[PDB]
Amino acid sequence: SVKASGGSSLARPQLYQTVPVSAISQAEQQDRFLEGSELNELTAYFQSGALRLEIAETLTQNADLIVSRAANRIFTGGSPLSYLEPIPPGFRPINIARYGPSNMQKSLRDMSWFLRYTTYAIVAGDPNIIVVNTRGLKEVIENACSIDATIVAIQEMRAASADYFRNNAQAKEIVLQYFDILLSEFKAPTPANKVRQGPSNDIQGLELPQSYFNAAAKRQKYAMKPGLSALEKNAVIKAAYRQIFERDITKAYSQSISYLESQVRNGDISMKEFVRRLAKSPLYRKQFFEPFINSRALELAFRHILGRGPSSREEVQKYFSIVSSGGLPALVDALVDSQEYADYFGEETVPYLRGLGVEAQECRNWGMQQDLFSYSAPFRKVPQFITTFAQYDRPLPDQHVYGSGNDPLEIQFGAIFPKETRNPSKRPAPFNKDTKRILIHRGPAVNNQVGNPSAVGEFPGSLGAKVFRLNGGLPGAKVGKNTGTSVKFGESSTQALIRAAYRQVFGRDLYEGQRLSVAEIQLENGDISVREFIKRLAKSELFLKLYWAPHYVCKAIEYMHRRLLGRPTYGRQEMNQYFDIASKQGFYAVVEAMIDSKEYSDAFGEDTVPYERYLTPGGLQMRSARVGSLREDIGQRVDKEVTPRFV
Amino acid sequence: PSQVAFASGDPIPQNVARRTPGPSLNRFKEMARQVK
Amino acid sequence: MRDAVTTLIKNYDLTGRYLDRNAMDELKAYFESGSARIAAAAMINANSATIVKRAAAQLFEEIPELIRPSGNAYTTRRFSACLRDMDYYLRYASYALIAADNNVLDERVLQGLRETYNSLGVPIGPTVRGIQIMKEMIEAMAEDSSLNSTDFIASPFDHMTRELSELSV
Amino acid sequence: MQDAITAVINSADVQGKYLDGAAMDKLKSYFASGELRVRAASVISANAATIVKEAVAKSLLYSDVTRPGGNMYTTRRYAACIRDLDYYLRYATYAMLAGDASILDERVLNGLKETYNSLGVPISSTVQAIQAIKEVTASLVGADAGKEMGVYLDYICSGLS
Amino acid sequence: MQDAITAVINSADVQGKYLDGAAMDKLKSYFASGELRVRAASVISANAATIVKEAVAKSLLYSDVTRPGGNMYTTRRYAACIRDLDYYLRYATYAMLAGDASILDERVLNGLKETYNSLGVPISSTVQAIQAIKEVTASLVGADAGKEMGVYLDYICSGLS
Amino acid sequence: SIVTKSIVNADAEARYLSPGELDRIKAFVTGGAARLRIAETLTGSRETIVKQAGDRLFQKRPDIVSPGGNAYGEEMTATCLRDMDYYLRLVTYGVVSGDVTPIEEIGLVGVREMYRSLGTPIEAVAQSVREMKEVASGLMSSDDAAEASAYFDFVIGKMS
Amino acid sequence: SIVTKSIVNADAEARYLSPGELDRIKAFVTGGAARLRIAETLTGSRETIVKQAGDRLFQKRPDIVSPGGNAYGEEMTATCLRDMDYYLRLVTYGVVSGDVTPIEEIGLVGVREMYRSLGTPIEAVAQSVREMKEVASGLMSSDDAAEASAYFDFVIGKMS
Amino acid sequence: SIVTKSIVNADAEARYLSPGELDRIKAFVTGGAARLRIAETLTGSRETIVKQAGDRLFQKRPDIVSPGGNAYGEEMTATCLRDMDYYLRLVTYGVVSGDVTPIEEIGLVGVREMYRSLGTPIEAVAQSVREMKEVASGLMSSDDAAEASAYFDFVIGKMS
Ligand SMILES: *[C@H](C)[C@H]1/C(=C/c2[nH]c(/C=C3N=C(/C=C4\NC(=O)C(CC)=C4C)C(C)=C\3CCC(=O)O)c(CCC(=O)O)c2C)NC(=O)[C@@H]1C
Ligand SMILES: *[C@H](C)[C@H]1/C(=C/c2[nH]c(/C=C3N=C(/C=C4\NC(=O)C(CC)=C4C)C(C)=C\3CCC(=O)O)c(CCC(=O)O)c2C)NC(=O)[C@@H]1C
Ligand SMILES: *[C@H](C)[C@H]1/C(=C/c2[nH]c(/C=C3N=C(/C=C4\NC(=O)C(CC)=C4C)C(C)=C\3CCC(=O)O)c(CCC(=O)O)c2C)NC(=O)[C@@H]1C
Ligand SMILES: *[C@H](C)[C@H]1/C(=C/c2[nH]c(/C=C3N=C(/C=C4\NC(=O)C(CC)=C4C)C(C)=C\3CCC(=O)O)c(CCC(=O)O)c2C)NC(=O)[C@@H]1C
Numbered sequence A: 001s002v003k004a005s006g007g008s009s010l011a012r013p014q015l016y017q018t019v020p021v022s023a024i025s026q027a028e029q030q031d032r033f034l035e036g037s038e039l040n041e042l043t044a045y046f047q048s049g050a051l052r053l054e055i056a057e058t059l060t061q062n063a064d065l066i067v068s069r070a071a072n073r074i075f076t077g078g079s080p081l082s083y084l085e086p087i088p089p090g091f092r093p094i095n096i097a098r099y100g101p102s103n104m105q106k107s108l109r110d111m112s113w114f115l116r117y118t119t120y121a122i123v124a125g126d127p128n129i130i131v132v133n134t135r136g137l138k139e140v141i142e143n144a145c146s147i148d149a150t151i152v153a154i155q156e157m158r159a160a161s162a163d164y165f166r167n168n169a170q171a172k173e174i175v176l177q178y179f180d181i182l183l184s185e186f187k188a189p190t191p192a193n194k195v196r197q198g199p200s201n202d203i204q205g206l207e208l209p210q211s212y213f214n215a216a217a218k219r220q221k222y223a224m225k226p227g228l229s230a231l232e233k234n235a236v237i238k239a240a241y242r243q244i245f246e247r248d249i250t251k252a253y254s255q256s257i258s259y260l261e262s263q264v265r266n267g268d269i270s271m272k273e274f275v276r277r278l279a280k281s282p283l284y285r286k287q288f289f290e291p292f293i294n295s296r297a298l299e300l301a302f303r304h305i306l307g308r309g310p311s312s313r314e315e316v317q318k319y320f321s322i323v324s325s326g327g328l329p330a331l332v333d334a335l336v337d338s339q340e341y342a343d344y345f346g347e348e349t350v351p352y353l354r355g356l357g358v359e360a361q362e363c364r365n366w367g368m369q370q371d372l373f374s375y376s377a378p379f380r381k382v383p384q385f386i387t388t389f390a391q392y393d394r395p396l397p398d399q400h401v402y403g404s405g406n407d408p409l410e411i412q413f414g415a416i417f418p419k420e421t422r423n424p425s426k427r428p429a430p431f432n433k434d435t436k437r438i439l440i441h442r443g444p445a446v447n448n449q450v451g452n453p454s455a456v457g458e459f460p461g462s463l464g465a466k467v468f469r470l471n472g473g474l475p476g477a478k479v480g481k482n483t484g485t486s487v488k489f490g491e492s493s494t495q496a497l498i499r500a501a502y503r504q505v506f507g508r509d510l511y512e513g514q515r516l517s518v519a520e521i522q523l524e525n526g527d528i529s530v531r532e533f534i535k536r537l538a539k540s541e542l543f544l545k546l547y548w549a550p551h552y553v554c555k556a557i558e559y560m561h562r563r564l565l566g567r568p569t570y571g572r573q574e575m576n577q578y579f580d581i582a583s584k585q586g587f588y589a590v591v592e593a594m595i596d597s598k599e600y601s602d603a604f605g606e607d608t609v610p611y612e613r614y615l616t617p618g619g620l621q622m623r624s625a626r627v628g629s630l631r632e633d634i635g636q637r638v639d640k641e642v643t644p645r646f647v
Numbered sequence B: 001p002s003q004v005a006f007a008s009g010d011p012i013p014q015n016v017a018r019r020t021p022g023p024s025l026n027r028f029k030e031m032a033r034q035v036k
Numbered sequence C: 001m002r003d004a005v006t007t008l009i010k011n012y013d014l015t016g017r018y019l020d021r022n023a024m025d026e027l028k029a030y031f032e033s034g035s036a037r038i039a040a041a042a043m044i045n046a047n048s049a050t051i052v053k054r055a056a057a058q059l060f061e062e063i064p065e066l067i068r069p070s071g072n073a074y075t076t077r078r079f080s081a082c083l084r085d086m087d088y089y090l091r092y093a094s095y096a097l098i099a100a101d102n103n104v105l106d107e108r109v110l111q112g113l114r115e116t117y118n119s120l121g122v123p124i125g126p127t128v129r130g131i132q133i134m135k136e137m138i139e140a141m142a143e144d145s146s147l148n149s150t151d152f153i154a155s156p157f158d159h160m161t162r163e164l165s166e167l168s169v
Numbered sequence D, E: 001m002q003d004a005i006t007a008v009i010n011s012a013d014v015q016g017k018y019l020d021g022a023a024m025d026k027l028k029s030y031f032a033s034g035e036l037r038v039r040a041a042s043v044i045s046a047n048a049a050t051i052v053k054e055a056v057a058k059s060l061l062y063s064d065v066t067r068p069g070g071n072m073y074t075t076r077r078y079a080a081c082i083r084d085l086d087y088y089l090r091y092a093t094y095a096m097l098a099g100d101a102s103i104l105d106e107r108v109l110n111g112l113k114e115t116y117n118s119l120g121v122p123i124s125s126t127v128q129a130i131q132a133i134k135e136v137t138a139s140l141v142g143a144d145a146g147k148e149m150g151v152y153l154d155y156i157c158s159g160l161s
Numbered sequence F, G, H: 001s002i003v004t005k006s007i008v009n010a011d012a013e014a015r016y017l018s019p020g021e022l023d024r025i026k027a028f029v030t031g032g033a034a035r036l037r038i039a040e041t042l043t044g045s046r047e048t049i050v051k052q053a054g055d056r057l058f059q060k061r062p063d064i065v066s067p068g069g070n071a072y073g074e075e076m077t078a079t080c081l082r083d084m085d086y087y088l089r090l091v092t093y094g095v096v097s098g099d100v101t102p103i104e105e106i107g108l109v110g111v112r113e114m115y116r117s118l119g120t121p122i123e124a125v126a127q128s129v130r131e132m133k134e135v136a137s138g139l140m141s142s143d144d145a146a147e148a149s150a151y152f153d154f155v156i157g158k159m160s
């Protein structure tokens, strides 16, 4: 399996274009309200739509009759309708028995599905659904189906739909032209596939059929020609600002460089030269270079100029070396004066975001580019490309099975988790079921249960956390100290145990009206053991309110396991177990399961208060990789400082 | 004026049919026809 | 991208070792099999379009729901995209055959395949089935053709099956 | 988590203002549609397994997802998917009762996408599954209740997307 | 974890068909090598501490790593490195018995780099120590089975890259 | 609110709301109009209640406004009346919510640690809320104030 | 596999494979040709065993094929025979691997929760494997039938 | 009972009853005569409910009465009528208590383990209570039926 995941954000491909879709998206890409044009697109469609309902309603009802009259004309030698699911060029009627039942079932359903897609075409009001699904169909159907028989079948249906309807010339012509498009697209052979050639050796070459880029909403492409009237020239410049700055900033804040605008309006500098000068401008520098790391600003510079994310590990490595050498100008210069930029946009065309629909996509930087094309990209300040690309070659990282966000910070108190929304730093990794996470023991390294399972109930001797035990006799256990004995020495020890037992369940010491006084005195009397006392504090409504309720279910399970057992979960096997209990039984039973677990009983007895036994490598790094606490012999060469021989 | 109510008014219920065994289980459909 | 030569270099470079007897023998095994690997690559280059189409035709007869409604191979747009994908897997296995290493198969195919297929709604089960049908189509054609070694042909397609498919057990 | 009442209180508390005329109107709006929410919840409570059953039946059954190689083939995975749909319906009901989608953020959509990507679960398939809930829910719960339930289930879809 | 058997089972299960002729051939090839696999495992089981001893003496002992300033100087750190090499030899045997390096990805190299970076464990010196195991194991077991063991020992090394 | 508390309790047992908890919400919803009347009357004379109850406090416990007392001084008396306005605002949140959770989360949890650090007697703040109840009950009608005083009585009970 | 379970047990105790454990793998690899013969026998009658077990189930439990039942209609009965074929294949994987883990991970772990959503009597599917076992033993020898029965009985035991 | 449920919730936090908790008992005790009216109607025509809803189950799901089913024969049909009579008795205990705890302690906790050992489909028992709800709602007034069905729906929800 793969060791890294870039993310799997929802992809929404446009299967076919409708009139409302074509109208709305036209102004959406331009970042405008629907003007007198785009409103009139809808107005004429909504008026005709009532008639377009009557087209389909007749054709949906009489669908059985159209396909029956078609199949009878085409297929000879029996009845084709036994197993229902004008210009002849030179067709020969196909025998029913000779063609075979399996081929006949295909033939019949396609004839119905051709008419079905015609009815959808009128209702949509755009023959896009036809153009896509009919263009590259002649070639694939040629193998085991005659083309000559299909043309006359559609032409029969054209006449069949004409005679059955026949209302008005303003009504029937919609039926006629859509059928006329249908036969013309079917007569047309399969066009050449769109070949996305790799710009260098590092990036793979791709191919996309001439059907996928026929529906998936074409990105509006603006080119600065010197003769254009200044209204559409303004539309080009606004689009150029919408590409570089992700949004129209000249409308928002009136932030515009008129010095550069004037030169492009004339034709002194090209759009290639404009993008160059605009991306090295202090206006871009402040917004997409200054707030970001060198790696992330590089990743943003890719989508602004080239209109795509970095494709390969080698590409990020190359372009980071450029931005380290000469900075932002040198990076911009490398991006504009590339073989890719001049191939896609040339000199005149404004850069555009080439995503799922525009071109063929590679299976490498899918989710990394999906989040990048979003407007929420310049808030993810953690790089997504260089992180995933490096993690691809490496094995599985030190991470919780349900992501990096599921890992809490290894602190004394407070369940603090990285938020998915606030500062996107989600790092998915394909963890399987039987994947045990390597955990660092607080005590001796030999006392790890992975290598030494017998030494699970061994106390950390001044290496890890302090162990609290009810070793000493509880006050008022035996009737030796009769009535009096005001100075019973064994009283402060059990109270310190209670406080520590509170400190383990809830990281911090609680307030006055939060302490369970009933549970405390039962432990002090010797009615319940520590195991029962820890269980009661974790079964408290306060623990539910503070740690369980405000947090994500599996985050709350993970933190509870780090508090009750003092250990992060090894992997899926344990996490799925408690998550199954959380679904069926509830929170209280999850508490019960973690206490009544065998590993709890082995590590901590009936008198032992739980403690931090194991840390995550990331957690220990936070503790012992700071300026202090770090030893000299961790990751540094130690030279023996000896007095010189001349001294 | 109240013709504008499409998403604000009463939603039109859509018929979604139960998904049936397909021609992958034609072997088993043949078996179920002979199990009588 | 890494071949069997580069993988062996990287393995010995990591440890900082000169190429020993075991290293030279593994290279010699590659160079002797290389002639059969190019000849196998010449076979699939000849029958690139024919295998892809026939393997798809077998797949849509095995799992008919793909080319039926609600299926992800229903429309012409989907049918062209699936045959393109089948063309991709054969093309990258073509690279993997000569390379004798599944690094090219990992880096440019498998790395972000699960993420993409889960996004659009592309099935991952019928996919690896379609890859395995292609494998059986190559192996049978390689058995028919005058080829001495045919065992290396199964390697890239099985790796394509292992990495992409869900862990059942 | 916060409900519609708590949302008004917390907004007044952060400003440090007493409940003004606009705040009283916001509460009265929630108290107008409260009997509807309680009656809606009792329907979902009864047909807890039934809604999930039909949702899988209309979308997920006899598909490539439940077929071998899929992410819902094995019985352990099928039960885990059912478990997820049981979570989604219950928390949507809570949000419907609350009149706020704050619970869905705190409990469900805090780190669900990162979990699903790590597991390799098709989000596209789950979005279709929760959309399948939406129709089955509205069939039993009603129109105005179905519109309310329709919003919160779409919010789960929005968070996953 | 996945062995050579379960890998064939996994591949057949996701296809949704019974084990074919090609599947049977892959099993028989493993069972033929299985006699050499168990034989090697038993010798490594008996000679477990001795292989580690010879490996530490080859690379680690009388070096800067074991001397003051090194990471294998402290007694709790020395015994840790012994146990670490006790892991590597055990799990390499596990992978040798399995016929797959799946267990190494799941348990051994599962965030091993980040573990070793946080503690300050030398990456170069540990790789040489695994290579010291590899050389000793091959000289102890044989030229065929020791080389077969050496594949998984190199897999740990390449995983630490 | 009471909706929030019911859901949290339901999620704790991983179950849909019991018809007892459903009956709890629906009756609160129908009897919400009376609860908004209480909040309106308390808001309407918010500067009347605090002023009167403060005067009752400094008469019953005058050691508070004596040298040594915590609320001794023109600035310190003002802060006490500011505190009394907070708890009155907390009450209005509690009555509206139909639950004592908003009073707890904001102005009851860690109140003992707060007034200890400030050097304020907790029993005297309990007296101020007790006198706040008496003035509020005088303005409202018999049955209306009786169910309104219960929220005051919690603030007294949690502090004293 | 019998290897995988041996490794897991040894890893849990943090030790090398026991001389007893190694001998069981030794007995497995030597009898590898024997267990693959049983699989081929089960694969040979992949549409015969589940057919006979189907007929035997619907005569013993006709409520299944009766109106109101889970497997009512020709479409649902096909899905029941599909479940039969799935479990027979799961036993086929089990006898090859010589382990119940390649069986449990697919179609035993969370199977009660699985059939609950579909509204299927689990004890009826338990009888489905019982009828499968008896037919499979009929179209087999004597010594290898007991080895096949052991894994069949696990499928029954965990389901019932 | 709703009184006991309130006490045990208050005792868990070690506190007196909430203003909302006391109000709910007050609302229960005032509407106790209405809850007694629901009981008296259900106890009066108890035999007519279970007979009709029983027959309505047998026409919907005849696989129960058909051979192979759990309730096959006139003796086992009478047991199924008794089971529904026992569950109608639990609802009457539930409505007077004002809580679902009495229904849980007797005939909900460990029901899935019970009907498994009897081999009874629990979804069919869930559907029997559904029919029992329908006949009871048509028997008595709609304002009382909405309160009665709320406790019925819980029994359905816990069963299914
Ligand atoms: C030297 C002290 C240690 C060390 C460094 C090291 N770094 C890389 C590669 C990269 N460096 C960075 C980090 C940054 N990006 C930023 O934006 C900033 C802040 C301005 C920094 C410092 C990144 C992202 C890379 C990746 C680019 C690349 O591939 O070169 C390496 C190379 C690792 C590799 O080849 O994959 C190294 C070695 N590591 C050590 O060993 C030293 C102790
Ligand atoms: C006081 C100087 C300022 C202030 C404090 C404040 N803190 C919290 C809550 C928490 N404090 C911590 C931090 C720590 N965890 C540790 O391990 C340590 C070192 C021992 C510390 C200091 C944590 C984890 C929390 C979270 C909740 C908890 O108590 O466990 C709050 C409350 C935040 C909330 O909204 O819950 C506050 C207000 N803030 C100020 O206004 C002061 C300037
Ligand atoms: C020949 C007289 C008739 C015929 C036979 C035929 N059809 C198929 C299968 C397919 N049909 C299509 C076509 C469509 N895809 C679309 O999007 C639409 C709507 C505009 C249609 C009608 C496709 C793509 C297939 C292949 C998928 C499948 O297997 O169903 C076949 C099988 C092809 C083969 O030999 O592999 C045959 C023989 N179809 C016609 O057009 C005639 C009416
Ligand atoms: C055919 C075997 C199956 C199938 C295919 C299918 N895939 C898509 C969508 C995409 N395919 C890819 C994947 C790749 N591109 C790569 O670079 C590689 C590595 C070499 C692969 C495998 C991508 C990126 C897309 C999306 C954009 C694009 O088309 O380039 C579709 C289209 C889905 C839709 O309807 O939008 C289809 C049909 N689907 C099946 O059902 C078959 C089992």
Ligand SMILES: *[C@H](C)[C@H]1/C(=C/c2[nH]c(/C=C3N=C(/C=C4\NC(=O)C(CC)=C4C)C(C)=C\3CCC(=O)O)c(CCC(=O)O)c2C)NC(=O)[C@@H]1C
Pocket (backbone or CB within 6 Å): A402, A552, A553, A554, A555, A572, A573, A575, A576, A579, D060, D065, D070, D071, D072, D076, D077, D078, D080, D081, D082, D083, D084, D085, D087, D107, D108, D109, D112, D115, D119, D121, D122, D125, D126, D129
């Ligand atoms: C069902 C609609 C589809 C589906 C679901 C599916 N999900 C998983 C995996 C997990 N789901 C979660 C997520 C959650 N954590 C939470 O806190 C909550 C409640 C708010 C949820 C929903 C988790 C933690 C897991 C992992 C559990 C585990 O370890 O097994 C699976 C299991 C996949 C696997 O076993 O690898 C499944 C099946 N996927 C589909 O195919 C359906 C379309």
Ligand SMILES: *[C@H](C)[C@H]1/C(=C/c2[nH]c(/C=C3N=C(/C=C4\NC(=O)C(CC)=C4C)C(C)=C\3CCC(=O)O)c(CCC(=O)O)c2C)NC(=O)[C@@H]1C
Pocket (backbone or CB within 6 Å): E057, E060, E061, E062, E063, E066, E067, E073, E074, E075, E078
């Ligand atoms: C003398 C009292 C006994 C003895 C000594 C002996 N020791 C070794 C090997 C080592 N001893 C240590 C132990 C330590 N070094 C440390 O850093 C510390 C903590 C401060 C201790 C206690 C180590 C690490 C070594 C390895 C040597 C190296 O630096 O490489 C040997 C050599 C063993 C061999 O044959 O290789 C010997 C002889 N042995 C006896 O018989 C005496 C009873």
Ligand SMILES: *[C@H](C)[C@H]1/C(=C/c2[nH]c(/C=C3N=C(/C=C4\NC(=O)C(CC)=C4C)C(C)=C\3CCC(=O)O)c(CCC(=O)O)c2C)NC(=O)[C@@H]1C
Pocket (backbone or CB within 6 Å): A438, A439, A440, A441, A442, A444, A445, A446, A447, A448, A450, E065, E070, E071, E072, E076, E077, E078, E080, E081, E082, E084, E085, E087, E107, E108, E115, E119, E121, E122, E125, E126, E129
């Ligand atoms: C010896 C080859 C080199 C070396 C080793 C060394 N390791 C540690 C500490 C730990 N080792 C691990 C790693 C693992 N635990 C696992 O579960 C696995 C997978 C099977 C492994 C390999 C862990 C977790 C620790 C932390 C302590 C613990 O046991 O929990 C140390 C000590 C570091 C310290 O300062 O504490 C050492 C020295 N280092 C060398 O010098 C050798 C080259």
Ligand SMILES: *[C@H](C)[C@H]1/C(=C/c2[nH]c(/C=C3N=C(/C=C4\NC(=O)C(CC)=C4C)C(C)=C\3CCC(=O)O)c(CCC(=O)O)c2C)NC(=O)[C@@H]1C
Pocket (backbone or CB within 6 Å): D061, D062, D063, D066, D067, D073, D074, D075, D078, G064, G069, G070, G071, G072, G076, G077, G079, G080, G081, G083, G084, G086, G087, G090, G106, G107, G118, G119, G120, G121, G124, G125, G128
């Ligand atoms: C026949 C013995 C009994 C029966 C069967 C029945 N099952 C279903 C539905 C499903 N069956 C399964 C189970 C499996 N899929 C797996 O992956 C495995 C393990 C290898 C098994 C055994 C599943 C997941 C389904 C869903 C359908 C699908 O996957 O496409 C039905 C259909 C019921 C419905 O429509 O809801 C039936 C009838 N029913 C009986 O009454 C027999 C005793």
